Amino acid sequence: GEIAALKQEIAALKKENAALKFEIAALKQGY
């Protein structure tokens, strides 16, 4: 399913944008 694969990709990207965003905040708290 093309739509399903495309949603999966978006899922993954959201997960990454969460993770890298958590990295930011953690650096600002640390530094």
Add this chain to the structure above:
Amino acid sequence: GEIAALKQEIAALKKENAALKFEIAALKQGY
């Protein structure tokens, strides 16, 4: 077009993951 809108969304997310990633590197260089 559902596929087109979905690709657009992925485009946007990639753009964000780039931006927040640039923020990271820039903080590590700074700090």
